[PDB]
Amino acid sequence: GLSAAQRQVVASTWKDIAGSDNGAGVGKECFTKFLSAHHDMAAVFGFSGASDPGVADLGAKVLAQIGVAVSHLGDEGKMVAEMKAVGVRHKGYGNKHIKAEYFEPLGASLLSAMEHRIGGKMNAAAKDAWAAAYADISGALISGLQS
Ligand code: HEM
Numbered sequence: 001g002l003s004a005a006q007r008q009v010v011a012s013t014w015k016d017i018a019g020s021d022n023g024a025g026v027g028k029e030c031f032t033k034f035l036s037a038h039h040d041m042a043a044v045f046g047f048s049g050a051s052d053p054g055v056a057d058l059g060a061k062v063l064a065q066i067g068v069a070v071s072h073l074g075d076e077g078k079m080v081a082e083m084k085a086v087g088v089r090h091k092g093y094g095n096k097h098i099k100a101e102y103f104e105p106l107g108a109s110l111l112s113a114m115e116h117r118i119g120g121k122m123n124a125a126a127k128d129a130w131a132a133a134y135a136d137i138s139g140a141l142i143s144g145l146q147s
Contacts, residue, residue, distance in 0.1 A: 001076075001132075001136070002129075007074065009125055010073065010129045010133045011070060013118065013122065013129075013130070014066075016117075016118045016121055017114050022060070022064050022067055023064065023067060024059065026114055026117050027058070027059025027062050029113040029117075030059060031055045031109075032050050032051075032055055032059075033109050034105070034109040035049065035055065036050045037109075041102065043095055044097070045058070045094045066137065069082070069083060079137070079140070080143070084143050084144035087140065087141035087143060087145040088147060089144075090144070090145045091145060100142045100145070100146070103138040103141075103142060106138075107138065111127060111130060115127070
């Protein structure tokens with residue numbers, strides 16, 4: 001759902017997470033560590049492994065879309081409609097068997113990459129606001145994927 005305080009914490013820490021590369025470095029770290037930890041997930045993405053060039057490319061696109069979702073957080077119906085559309089496109093991505101269960105371990109890796117970039121700015125309040133935001137953003141994508 002996200003409270004106004006949680007929307008405000010994610011909107012303000014996104015400025016630091018985005019940096020000067022629109023979160024591309026965070027995206028690269030997230031998917032590289034995720035695929036190094038679960039080699040079994042490389043086939044779901046259609047990648048050869050964690051060092052496939054496609055990992056850094058996908059990481060930049062995922063984090064750029066989270067930046068769009070963050071700018072629309074004040075209108076939930078807008079944010080979920082656009083994330084559902086992203087989700088509908090995932091029916092035809094990677095192996096065409098992307099499952100909802102895969103999104104929760106990916107969330108842990110995203111939060112970790114975010115904290116690695118902004119350090120202490122990713123305090124307990126920021127981690128809770130971003131876990132709440134990642135739950136809504138991925139939840140809406142999963143809804144498009146299962147539609
Ligand atoms: C573990 C779950 C996920 C899997 C397996 C997955 C897989 C993929 C794959 C394989 C592509 C490349 C498409 C191509 O070849 O053209 C893709 C694109 C994309 N993914 Fe995901 N994805 C996942 C999670 C996410 C998340 C959390 C977001 C949330 C913002 C996201 C956003 C996107 C975006 C924006 C694109 C670019 C193309 C588009 O807009 O549809 N993905 N994803």
